C-alpha cells in the first residue's frame, strides 16, 4: 500500500468535521489528543488501584500503572540505589547525606551513579506530570564530589560532561587539568565535551581555536582513546561560527572520518551543509558541496547515529531552493523516499519547511502539468500549504496560461484555512480580472469573485471595520460586468463611496459600455456622478462622451450642468 | 396581540424528490459504478447490475433476514418512488381537461374506453388474466378505490363481448397480464445402467423425519431389500409392508422389479412412508406417461408435509391448553 | 452501584409521572407539580470539584505559544468558581421567574376578552 492522497495523515480522525483544515489545526489537533493521553496517564498513575486488574493473556507490561515512588524506607546503600534509579535528585542527596553522617560506607560505584544523576540534570528535579548558565554555583554535585573519599576516572568524567552540558565551559576545562595532574585518562565522551568547551569557553579568532582543538585530538591519541562519530560531529557543529574560515578545515575533518573508518551520518553532512550555506552567493562553493554530498548518499539507507540526523533533509532542501535547481531537489527527495529514510524528516516544523521549500521550487521550475500532480500528491496528504505557496502556485498557472484552474485554487485555499488572507484574495482577483477571456471562462471567474466577495463581507474581523482594498473592489466589479451580471456591478458602486475607495479608470469605461447597451441615461449619469466626486480627469472627457452617446433629458442635462459647474 | 404556541415542526412531514435531485442521484450512481468496478478489478464498461449486487454483498455482508433491509446500490430509478409530475404550468392552468376530477388519469381512461364502445355500435382466458388493482394503480400513477377497479374491469369485459377490432385489441391487451401456470407433470428420473448392464432408476423420499433412497431396477422378481434386509424382516408390521405394495400394485407391476433402498430416521411408519415415496418416484421411469399421472392423482408422488408441530410456551402441547382453572 | 444508575431521560420520565392512570384522565391534580430541569445546561465539560485545569478541554491548549500543562485551581480560586456557578444558577432561575404578565379579560379567571393575536399566515404567503 502507498500513501492515500485524498486523506490527511493517519493520526487524525478521518471525518470531515474532525479533519484538520489548516497547518495550525494540524499541529493543534495532535497536541489536544496528546494532552488527553497525558491526562489519562496522570489519572492512571494517580489512582493506580483502579487499573491493577490484569485480565490480559499474555500479560501486557506496558498497560499497567507506573510507580515512581521508592518502596524501601530503610536508610542504607541498597535504598539509595533505588532513589537513583527513579531519578530522585533531592531524596537521593538527603539519603546520601544522612547515610554519610551515620558513618556507613557508600560504595564508589554508587557514589558515581549519584553524580551521573546530579551532573546530568544539574541538581534539579526532572519534569513531572503534576505535583544563560544553569550550572548553579551552589550545587550538590560539586559538594558531594569534594567530600568524595576516593575518585576514579569515571567520577571526573561525569563531572566534566555535566558542566559542559549546563554551559559551565570554563569550569570543565579547569577540571580537565586536575584529571591530568592526577595521572588519569579520560574517555571519548569526556573529550567530546571538552572540544565543545574549547570553542565556547572564550571568543577568539579561528586560528587560536583551531590550534587548541588539534591539541585535544592529539591528546586523545596519546591516551589511546579512539574517537567516535560524535567527536567529529561536535567539531563540525562548533565550526559553524567561523563560516568561511572553517570551510577548508571542516572538509579536512570529513576526509579524516572516511580514512579512519568512522562513517559520516546524515548529521555529519547537515553540519557541513550549514557551514557552507552562508549568506552570500552560493554558486561559488555551495554548488559542488551539495552535488558531491548527494552522489555519495545516492541510494543509501540511513540508521540513527546522531541526534541531528533529522535535520539533513531540511538543510539540503534549503539549498536547492536557493540554487533554484530542480534536478538536485528530486535527488534529495529521492533519497528521502528510499527505504525508511522518510523518518529522518524531523518534527512537524521541519516537515512543513521541507515541503514548503520543495513544492515552491516545483511550481517555479517545473512544467505546470507536473506541478499539478505534485499539488495533488503532497497537499493535504503530506502537508497543509502556507498562503505563500498558493500564491507561488497561481504565479505558475499564470506563466503557463492555464487560468481555468483559478476557481479550483480558491476552493482548495478555503479548505486549507486561507479564506481570509488578504494577499491571497487580492492575487486571485487580479489574475482573474487582468485580461478579458472567452464567455465560458468569464462566467466561471464571476462565480468565484462572488464567493470571494462573500469572504470579504463575512470576515471574522467583522467586529473591526471591513477593509475592502481598492484593487479588490475594482476587480470584483469588472468581473461582474464582463460576465453580464450588470445588476450586481451597479449595486457595488455604492461601496466605493461608503469605503471611500478610488474607482479604476477601466471600471468606469466598461460601465459606460453596459449603459449604451441598455440605453439607460440615468445609469450613465450615475457613472459621471461617481467619477466627478473623485475629480478624475477622464470624467470631464467622459461627460462629453455621455452627451453624444446618450439622450440627455432636461433634468439629466441640468444634472450634467451641475457637474459642469463643479468642473 | 399575543402569541400562541406553534402547533408542530414543519420538518415533521413527508419529503419529496424533485427531478433535479434524481438527475444528480443518477450522476452519483454512474460515478460510484465505476469506483465499484475499480474496487473489484473489473472492466467498468461491462459492469452490470448483477455484478454490483454481487460486489455489494461481498463488501457489505449483511445477514438480516429481510432483503429490503440489506445494503443496496441500485440505480436511482429503481430506488426512488415514482413521482407524479406537476399538473399545471406557470400560469396555473392544469394541463389535463379532467384535472379537477382529482383522478384525471383514471377518468381519462374511462372516457377513452366509453368512447370506443360508442364507435363500435355506430359501426355495427387460460393464459391471460386481468391486472390487479395494485398494477392498475401504477399504470395510472394514481390512487384507486376497490369499486373504481371493478368499474374499469366491467367496462373492459363489456368491450371484449363486442366485435372488437385490432385497434380495440391492442388496448385491452395493455391491461392483460400473462398468468404463468406451473406444470403438475411429474419429473421422470433418468434411466441409468450398472456395471452388469441392468437398467435402474434412483429417487428419494421424505416422511416426517425419515429419509429414504430407493433404487428400482427395470427387471426383477419382486425382491425388496431395506438396508440389506428382506422387506418383511425389516417391516414386521403388516401395514408397513402394505405401503411398499401400494405403488407397484397401483400400476400392476407386482413381481416385476427388484428394489434396494436405504432409509434412516423416523419410526417404522415414517420409514415405510419415505420408502413408498422413494420407490414411487423411481418407478415412474418404467411406466407410461399416463400411468405416472394416475399415480400423481392417487397421492403416490406427493411429499407429505405433515410434520410434528412445535410446543408453544404456556400450553400443554402444540394445541392443547392447560386446564382453565375452576372459578 | 454504578450499574444501577440510569440516564437523565429515564429519571425524569419516572419522577415527573406524566404517563399513568393519574395523567390519563387527570385523576391527579397538580397544585404542586414536579418540573423538569435540565442539569447539563450550565455544566462545562472538563469542570470538576477538584478544580483541575485540563489543557484542551476546559482551558486553552496553548498559552504564550507553548502547550499548557496539567494544573489545579487553588482552594480559594475553586471556592469562587463554585460560588460563581451557584449565583449563575439563581440568576438563571431569576430570569425565568421574570415573565411578562398578560392583561386579564372580563375577569381575572375568565378567558373572554383576551387577545390571541393575528391569525396565522396562510400557506400561500397570506398574512392577517
Amino acid at each position: 500500500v502507498n500513501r492515500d492522497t485524498t486523506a490527511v495523515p493517519y493520526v487524525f480522525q478521518d471525518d470531515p468535521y474532525l479533519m484538520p483544515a489548516s497547518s495550525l489545526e494540524s499541529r493543534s489537533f495532535l497536541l489536544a489528543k496528546k494532552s488527553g493521553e497525558n491526562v489519562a496517564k496522570f489519572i492512571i498513575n494517580s489512582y493506580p488501584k483502579y487499573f491493577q486488574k490484569d485480565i490480559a493473556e499474555p500479560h501486557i507490561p506496558c498497560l499497567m500503572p507506573e510507580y515512581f515512588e521508592p518502596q524501601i524506607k530503610d536508610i542504607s546503600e541498597a535504598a539509595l540505589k533505588e532513589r537513583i534509579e527513579l531519578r530522585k535528585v533531592k531524596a537521593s542527596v538527603d539519603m546520601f547525606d544522612q547515610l554519610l553522617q551515620a558513618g556507613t560506607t557508600v560504595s564508589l560505584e554508587t557514589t558515581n551513579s549519584l553524580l551521573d544523576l546530579l551532573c546530568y540534570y544539574g541538581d534539579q528535579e526532572p519534569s513531572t506530570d503534576y505535583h544563560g548558565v544553569t550550572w548553579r554555583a551552589k550545587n550538590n554535585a560539586e559538594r558531594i564530589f569534594s567530600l568524595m573519599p576516593e575518585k576514579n576516572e569515571h567520577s571526573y568524567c561525569t563531572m566534566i560532561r555535566g558542566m559542559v552540558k549546563h554551559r559551565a565551559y570554563e569550569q570543565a576545562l579547569n577540571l580537565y587539568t586536575e584529571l591530568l595532574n592526577n595521572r588519569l585518562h579520560a574517555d571519548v565522551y569526556t573529550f567530546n565535551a571538552l572540544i565543545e568547551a574549547t570553542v565556547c569557553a572564550i571568543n577568539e579568532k579561528f586560528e587560536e581555536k583551531w590550534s587548541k582543538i588539534l591539541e585535544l585530538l592529539r591528546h586523545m591519541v596519546a591516551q589511546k582513546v579512539k574517537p567516535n562519530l560524535q567527536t567529529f560531529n561536535t567539531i563540525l557543529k562548533c565550526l559553524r561560527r567561523f563560516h568561511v574560515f572553517a570551510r577548508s578545515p571542516a572538509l579536512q575533518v570529513l576526509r579524516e572520518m572516511k580514512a579512519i573508518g568512522i562513517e559520516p551520518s546524515l548529521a555529519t553532512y547537515h553540519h557541513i551543509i550549514r557551514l557552507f550555506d552562508q549568506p552570500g552567493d552560493p554558486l561559488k562553493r555551495s554548488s559542488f558541496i551539495i552535488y558531491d554530498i548527494m552522489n555519495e548518499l545516492m541510494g543509501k539507507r540511513f540508521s540513527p547515529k546522531d541526534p541531528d540526523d533529522d535535520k539533513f533533509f531540511q538543510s539540503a532542501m534549503s539549498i536547492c531552493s536557493s540554487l533554484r535547481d530542480l534536478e538536485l531537489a528530486y535527488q534529495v527527495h529521492g533519497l528521502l523516499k528510499t527505504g525508511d529514510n522518510w523518518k529522518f524528516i524531523g518534527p512537524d516544523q521541519h516537515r512543513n519547511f521541507y515541503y514548503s521549500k520543495f513544492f515552491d521550487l516545483i511550481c517555479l521550475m517545473e512544467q505546470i502539468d507536473v506541478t499539478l500532480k505534485w499539488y495533488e500528491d503532497l497537499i493535504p496528504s503530506a502537508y497543509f500549504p502556507h498562503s505563500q505557496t498558493m500564491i507561488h502556485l497561481l504565479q505558475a498557472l499564470d506563466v503557463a496560461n492555464r487560468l481555468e484552474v483559478i476557481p479550483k485554487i480558491w476552493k482548495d485555499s478555503k479548505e486549507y484555512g486561507h479564506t481570509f488572507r488578504s494577499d491571497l484574495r487580492e492575487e486571485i482577483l487580479m489574475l482573474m480580472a487582468r485580461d478579458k477571456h472567452p464567455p465560458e471562462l468569464q462566467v466561471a471567474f464571476a462565480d468565484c469573485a462572488a464567493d470571494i466577495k462573500s469572504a470579504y463581507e463575512s470576515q471574522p474581523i467583522r467586529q473591526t471595520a471591513q477593509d475592502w482594498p481598492a484593487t479588490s473592489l475594482n476587480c470584483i466589479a469588472i468581473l461582474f460586468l464582463r460576465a453580464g451580471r450588470t445588476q450586481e456591478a451597479w449595486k457595488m458602486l455604492g461601496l466605493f463611496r461608503k469605503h471611500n475607495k478610488i474607482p479604476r479608470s477601466e471600471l468606469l469605461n466598461e460601465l459606460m459600455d453596459s449603459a449604451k447597451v441598455s440605453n439607460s441615461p440615468s445609469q450613465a449619469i450615475e457613472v459621471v456622478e461617481l467619477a466627478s466626486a473623485f475629480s478624475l480627469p477622464i470624467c470631464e472627457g467622459l461627460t462629453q462622451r455621455v452627451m453624444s452617446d446618450f439622450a440627455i433629458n432636461q433634468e439629466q442635462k441640468e444634472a450634467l450642468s451641475n457637474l459642469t459647474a463643479l468642473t | 396581540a399575543f402569541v400562541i404556541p406553534k402547533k408542530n415542526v414543519p420538518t415533521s412531514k413527508r419529503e419529496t424528490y424533485t427531478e433535479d435531485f434524481i438527475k444528480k442521484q443518477i450522476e452519483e450512481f454512474n460515478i460510484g459504478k465505476r469506483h465499484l468496478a475499480n474496487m473489484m478489478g473489473e472492466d467498468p464498461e461491462t459492469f452490470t447490475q448483477e455484478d454490483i449486487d454481487r460486489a455489494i454483498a461481498y463488501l457489505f455482508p449483511s445477514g438480516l433476514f429481510e432483503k429490503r433491509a440489506r445494503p443496496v446500490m441500485k440505480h436511482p430509478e429503481q430506488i426512488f418512488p415514482r413521482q407524479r409530475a406537476i399538473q399545471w404550468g406557470e400560469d396555473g392552468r392544469p394541463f389535463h381537461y379532467l384535472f379537477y376530477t382529482g383522478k384525471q388519469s383514471y377518468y381519462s381512461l374511462m372516457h377513452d374506453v366509453y368512447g370506443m364502445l360508442l364507435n363500435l355500435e355506430k359501426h355495427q382466458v387460460i393464459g391471460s388474466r386481468w391486472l390487479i388493482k395494485e398494477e392498475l394503480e401504477e399504470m395510472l400513477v394514481e390512487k384507486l378505490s376497490d369499486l373504481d377497479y371493478m368499474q374499469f374491469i366491467r367496462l373492459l369485459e363489456k368491450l371484449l363481448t363486442s366485435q372488437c377490432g385490432a385497434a380495440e385489441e391492442e388496448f385491452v391487451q395493455r391491461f392483460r397480464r400473462s398468468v404463468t401456470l406451473e406444470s403438475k407433470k411429474q419429473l421422470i428420473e433418468p434411466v441409468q445402467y450398472d456395471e452388469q448392464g441392468m437398467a435402474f432408476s434412483k429417487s428419494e423420499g421424505k416422511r416426517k423425519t425419515a429419509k429414504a433412497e430407493a433404487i428400482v431396477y427395470k427387471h426383477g422378481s419382486g425382491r425388496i431389500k431395506v438396508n440389506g434386509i428382506d422387506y418383511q424382516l425389516y417391516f414386521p408390521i403388516t401395514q408397513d409392508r402394505e405401503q411398499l405394495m401400494f405403488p407397484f400394485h397401483f400400476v400392476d407391476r407386482l413381481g416385476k422389479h427388484d428394489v434396494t433402498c436405504t432409509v434412516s430416521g423416523g419410526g417404522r411408519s415414517a420409514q415405510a412412508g419415505a420408502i413408498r415415496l422413494a420407490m414411487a418416484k423411481a418407478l415412474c421411469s418404467f411406466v407410461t406417461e399416463d400411468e405416472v399421472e394416475w399415480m400423481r392423482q392417487a397421492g403416490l408422488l406427493t411429499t407429505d408435509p405433515r410434520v410434528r408441530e412445535r410446543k408453544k410456551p404456556g400450553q400443554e402441547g402444540a394445541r392443547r391448553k392447560f386446564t382453565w382453572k375452576k372459578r | 452501584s454504578f450499574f444501577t444508575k440510569l440516564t437523565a431521560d429515564e429519571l425524569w420520565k419516572g419522577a415527573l409521572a406524566e404517563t399513568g392512570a393519574g395523567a390519563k384522565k387527570g385523576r391527579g391534580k397538580r397544585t404542586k407539580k414536579k418540573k423538569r430541569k435540565d442539569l447539563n445546561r450550565g455544566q462545562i465539560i472538563g469542570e470538576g470539584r477538584y478544580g483541575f485545569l485540563w489543557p484542551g478541554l476546559n482551558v486553552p491548549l496553548m498559552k504564550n505559544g507553548a502547550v499548557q500543562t496539567i494544573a489545579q485551581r487553588s482552594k480559594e480560586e475553586q471556592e469562587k468558581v463554585e460560588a460563581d456557578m451557584i449565583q449563575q444558577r439563581e440568576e438563571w432561575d431569576r430570569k425565568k421567574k421574570m415573565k411578562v404578565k398578560r392583561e386579564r379579560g372580563w375577569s381575572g379567571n375568565s378567558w373572554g376578552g383576551i387577545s390571541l393575536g393575528p391569525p396565522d399566515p396562510g400557506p400561500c404567503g397570506e398574512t392577517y
Binding site: 479564506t419 | 402569541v3 | 398578560r102
Partner: peptide
C-alpha cells in the same frame, strides 16, 4: 397564561 409563558449562521473552514 396570564402569568406569562417564557420557555425561552455563517460557517468557516478553520474558524477562529
Amino acid at each position: 397564561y396570564l402569568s406569562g409563558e417564557e420557555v425561552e449562521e455563517y460557517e468557516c473552514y478553520a474558524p477562529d
